[PDB]
Amino acid sequence: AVQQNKKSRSARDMRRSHDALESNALSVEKSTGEVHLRHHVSPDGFYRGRKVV
Amino acid sequence: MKRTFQPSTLKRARVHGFRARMATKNGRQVLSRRRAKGRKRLTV
Amino acid sequence: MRHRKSGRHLSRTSAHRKAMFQNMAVSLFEHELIKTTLPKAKELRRVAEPLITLAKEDSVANRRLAFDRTRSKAAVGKLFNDLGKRYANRPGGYLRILKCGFRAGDNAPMAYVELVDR
Amino acid sequence: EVAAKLSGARISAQKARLVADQIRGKKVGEALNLLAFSSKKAAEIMKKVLESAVANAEHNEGADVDDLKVSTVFVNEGRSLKRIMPRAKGRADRIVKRSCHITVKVADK
Amino acid sequence: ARVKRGVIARRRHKKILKLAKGYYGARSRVFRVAKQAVIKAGQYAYRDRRQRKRQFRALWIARINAGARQNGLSYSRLIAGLKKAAIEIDRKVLADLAVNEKAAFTAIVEKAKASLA
RNA sequence: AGUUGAGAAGCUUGCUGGAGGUAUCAGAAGUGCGAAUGCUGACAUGAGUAACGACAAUGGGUGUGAAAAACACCCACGCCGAAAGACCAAGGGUUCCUGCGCAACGUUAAUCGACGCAGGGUUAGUCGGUUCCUAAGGCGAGGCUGAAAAGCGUAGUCGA
RNA sequence: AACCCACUCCCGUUGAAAAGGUAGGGGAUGACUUGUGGAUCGGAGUGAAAGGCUAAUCAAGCUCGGAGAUAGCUGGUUCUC
RNA sequence: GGGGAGUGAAAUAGAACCUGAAACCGUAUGCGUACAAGCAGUGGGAGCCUACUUGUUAGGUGACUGCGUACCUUUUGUAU
RNA sequence: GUCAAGUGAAGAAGCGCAUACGGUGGAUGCCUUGGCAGUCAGAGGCGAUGAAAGACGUGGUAGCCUGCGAAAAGCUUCGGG
């Protein structure tokens, strides 16, 4: 089951009009002052004003 | 699924070797063709 | 359709789950903090916490009911002597789960699972 | 306006323009936060390229990192590598291992 | 005298691709499709130097019809009355006077009604 | 880009390029490409889709690292066990080991490797071969035969 | 049982596999299976015979030549008025 | 792998290195595109945007609208 | 001011066209240490004094070419430079 015509630029790009990205769930610790994911331990091991690791 | 090349160095050298080619008239002219073409091996 | 159906398959047989979960229980009772995937952390808390609740009471029946489902002598000794006298006045929730980024090779969402008074 | 370029990144261009579309026009610290927490390979690569562009602006000019804005990101295509995957019934197919060229162009406008 | 034909083939393809620019997709950028689109544009343009003279005449006739009916006359009665008289004035400037100079067009339709056709 | 011709086309110029070009009129042609399921290279589309190679099975800890699901070690879990274990012939030909490495190769990553670079490692009177002997079969002084090439063969002498 | 085979289903058909896998199946002290070496070859071999096999090729292998065979057939044949 | 600095007449001659076309893939700017049905053009045509210097111009888009079933080859005949 | 009716400019997930810069890619131009075809000459063979064609060695670094041959990128003599 193949195409009978190659697809154009336009329809190729309209297909991929949906596959753009997001990850905006960042936040800053009040204690240390660094960015980390929401609800996640910091890359320097802090979580809600406390070192955990 | 057994394949068609089953290697043996003795059967190699006795069918296609140097002395087998130089035993017969036609193998001597195999070597002279294959030497006239300029080949590096000439006994395979 | 899994309406109201607990437990998760984790791409495994049931015996594989049982081995992996009592391994993680034993490893958490020795180290008190391990590092694992977030769904295996969500399913460890249903295996590992009844063992501590069982360990809050010293009986021979309790220590070989612990032993047949955490089958290592060292974790039955770590329970009933350390974890179970510590957690004797806490009504559940003996371990917490803290999400910690993603694994580098996959994107497996990672979590730390930690005994609460460590 | 200061560039940094990676000529030949072992990701393909279509996969890298996804992350390239995601930092374009942003502030540099915002862009570094986005790239440092993204789930992808192109963000590791493009974060290293953005670090290089920023440090080029710090050392070859006098711009502060707070002033800088990532102004032009574009991913061109690099030289592919041409390899064989053996398939069934004796048939061989060509794999192209695509590469790409990442250019981050930081500026203070 | 071996003669290498890649320098003239290029200029002939540039000429065809320049004539094809503004077109959709491969109609403007690959030669075997741009060539057909340029030939087809040429046929339509030949045909439409004719249909231009057909289409403007109908628009003039429709505007003269609309202007003459405001003064109580058809198009066809107007064209008949402008030949019971002798006006030798065409559909183009009558449509222009129908839109722009309406009193002059009213004078023309009254001299057609004056010839009672 | 402009411009001039009915056309093939011509002419003038901005940028690029950085060493050749050929008014005119003649001579000569490997003289003009869109098609030949045309040849050869590059690159599309399908599509970031299908797959990633038996459904023995993995989970933590610790280290190293720029970075570890995958390397190493520890703890534990499974799997083979007339083999998924040890070994000899054949075939291969350095793949073996140790340092350093990770571009490419490895259907992912790799700090690991049957991969790259450089070094080292293979010790025999007794184990295998040569050497001694012959089987099938080969070759074969002379010899019989055959347009020639050669065929067959005696003495012989190779051949495990 | 090993080993040798290949009757059935299902899968697979762009395969893990240019003929397999898993379940079952036939022979399994013989007209058996197999290693190593050797012999027979292209109107020519070998064949418990099917046009089977003779290097994934077989109603006449492969390769190189005659050779640019031949084709009343098919396809194509390039700038301008 | 780059950003400078140097060499060089020239490094967008930097070693995959003279020139560096087309296919194909991008980023930026302008304009048009989410009530509209088909070989994607062509005739008409508003609007907008740039250069000019303004106008009865030049370039770019082209809402809307009339007509409009590619090219080849073969055929009595092909959008087929 | 309110309420009706009429009318409709921006606001593009993405696309299209033009333009300008890029990337890929190797055409084109120019170039040649390689070929091709003749003319005029040569000398028409080499080998049991071991050939053509090779294998292995040969160097301070040492792989492969090219020379050499355990005297091994060379040895002895004449001659030229």
Side-chain angles (χ1 to χ4, degrees):
Chain A
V2 301
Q3 59 182 2
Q4 292 194 356
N5 280 112
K6 71 178 289 183
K7 191 175 285 286
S8 63
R9 272 87 165 174
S10 186
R12 192 268 314 273
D13 288 331
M14 289 175 187
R15 184 201 305 114
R16 56 183 73 177
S17 74
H18 285 284
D19 51 9
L21 302 170
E22 296 87 9
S23 181
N24 194 2
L26 302 183
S27 289
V28 179
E29 287 284 331
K30 292 174 70 68
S31 182
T32 303
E34 60 182 356
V35 181
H36 68 295
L37 267 80
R38 291 282 284 166
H39 302 95
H40 274 65
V41 180
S42 178
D44 202 76
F46 295 99
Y47 189 63
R48 59 172 67 192
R50 183 182 64 188
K51 190 171 188 175
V52 302
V53 66
Chain B
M1 200 70 204
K2 182 181 178 178
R3 301 299 178 188
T4 63
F5 176 62
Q6 304 297 323
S8 176
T9 311
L10 188 64
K11 295 173 79 75
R12 182 78 173 174
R14 287 181 179 175
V15 184
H16 304 97
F18 186 81
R19 292 181 57 82
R21 295 284 165 84
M22 200 161 283
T24 182
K25 187 71 175 293
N26 299 117
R28 282 184 284 110
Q29 71 184 2
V30 170
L31 295 177
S32 72
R33 282 180 288 175
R34 192 168 179 87
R35 180 181 288 118
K37 188 169 180 175
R39 284 195 177 272
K40 182 179 178 179
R41 266 112 219 209
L42 67 85
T43 291
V44 187
Chain C
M1 198 172 298
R2 57 98 43 219
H3 288 183
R4 301 183 69 83
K5 275 163 64 171
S6 179
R8 71 187 75 191
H9 293 90
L10 296 175
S11 186
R12 276 166 162 86
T13 63
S14 63
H16 203 309
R17 256 92 56 77
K18 190 170 180 293
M20 176 185 68
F21 283 149
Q22 77 177 6
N23 272 321
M24 292 180 69
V26 170
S27 295
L28 181 133
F29 301 141
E30 54 173 350
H31 295 105
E32 301 202 1
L33 181 277
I34 60 160
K35 166 63 168 284
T36 182
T37 313
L38 174 66
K40 299 185 187 75
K42 296 287 183 185
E43 292 283 320
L44 180 59
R45 65 195 297 172
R46 298 183 67 244
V47 177
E49 298 196 3
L51 287 171
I52 300 168
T53 308
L54 186 68
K56 292 194 279 192
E57 181 174 358
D58 279 331
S59 296
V60 173
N62 281 320
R63 296 183 80 165
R64 64 178 65 178
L65 185 66
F67 179 71
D68 62 0
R69 63 184 66 177
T70 191
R71 298 189 60 90
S72 62
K73 297 171 71 174
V76 172
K78 181 82 170 184
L79 294 170
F80 294 103
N81 283 321
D82 186 69
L83 313 177
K85 289 178 170 64
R86 180 187 299 173
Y87 289 143
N89 289 317
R90 181 177 293 276
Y94 310 112
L95 54 88
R96 85 187 81 200
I97 297 167
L98 297 174
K99 300 175 187 69
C100 53
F102 287 86
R103 177 182 282 176
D106 309 331
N107 265 330
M110 288 289 107
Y112 289 117
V113 51
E114 178 186 357
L115 293 172
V116 51
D117 286 328
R118 186 169 68 86
Chain D
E1 191 175 4
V2 175
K5 187 182 182 179
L6 177 54
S7 296
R10 270 73 178 175
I11 192 162
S12 76
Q14 180 180 352
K15 297 191 177 80
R17 295 186 187 105
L18 298 177
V19 178
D21 289 338
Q22 206 173 5
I23 59 166
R24 184 178 293 117
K26 287 187 173 292
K27 294 179 186 179
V28 161
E30 181 178 359
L32 288 178
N33 285 326
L34 195 151
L35 292 170
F37 289 101
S38 177
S39 299
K40 288 189 174 294
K41 180 182 181 179
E44 293 173 353
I45 298 166
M46 195 177 294
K47 184 175 171 67
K48 194 183 284 287
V49 177
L50 175 54
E51 292 288 337
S52 178
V54 169
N56 290 330
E58 302 175 9
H59 183 266
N60 295 115
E61 283 89 4
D64 194 359
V65 193
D66 304 330
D67 294 329
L68 290 177
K69 181 179 189 290
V70 44
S71 295
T72 299
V73 194
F74 59 92
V75 185
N76 289 322
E77 293 172 352
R79 175 177 291 107
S80 303
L81 275 66
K82 263 65 180 301
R83 280 159 196 172
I84 301 173
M85 186 161 68
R87 291 178 70 90
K89 297 189 177 186
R91 180 179 186 263
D93 285 340
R94 305 289 288 165
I95 297 296
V96 287
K97 300 189 76 72
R98 293 176 187 271
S99 67
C100 65
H101 295 166
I102 303 167
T103 300
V104 185
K105 191 85 71 74
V106 297
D108 55 358
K109 67 189 292 183
Chain E
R2 186 184 181 264
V3 31
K4 198 186 266 85
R5 57 185 174 96
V7 69
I8 310 300
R10 184 186 293 114
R11 77 182 181 190
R12 189 180 55 81
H13 290 193
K14 295 295 287 187
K15 179 180 171 183
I16 291 293
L17 285 161
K18 186 175 187 291
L19 275 177
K21 74 178 183 70
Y23 295 170
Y24 182 81
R27 300 287 188 105
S28 66
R29 72 193 77 187
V30 306
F31 178 77
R32 296 169 76 166
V33 183
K35 182 170 185 291
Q36 303 178 5
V38 169
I39 292 168
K40 188 72 173 178
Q43 306 179 14
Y44 282 155
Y46 187 88
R47 189 193 70 184
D48 284 327
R49 284 186 293 265
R50 273 78 187 161
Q51 288 184 358
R52 189 192 300 121
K53 289 182 271 295
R54 294 172 191 174
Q55 286 168 1
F56 274 107
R57 172 75 183 267
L59 184 60
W60 297 338
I61 285 171
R63 290 183 177 177
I64 291 160
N65 207 358
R69 290 180 183 273
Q70 287 178 352
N71 297 113
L73 197 63
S74 298
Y75 174 79
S76 66
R77 298 292 312 281
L78 176 67
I79 300 297
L82 291 182
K83 295 180 178 180
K84 284 285 185 67
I87 204 160
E88 286 87 10
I89 216 166
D90 65 355
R91 275 75 169 172
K92 181 176 76 176
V93 309
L94 282 179
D96 192 78
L97 300 177
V99 178
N100 302 115
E101 299 291 330
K102 292 184 179 183
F105 185 80
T106 309
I108 290 170
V109 302
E110 294 300 324
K111 202 177 288 292
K113 282 184 178 176
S115 296
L116 66 93

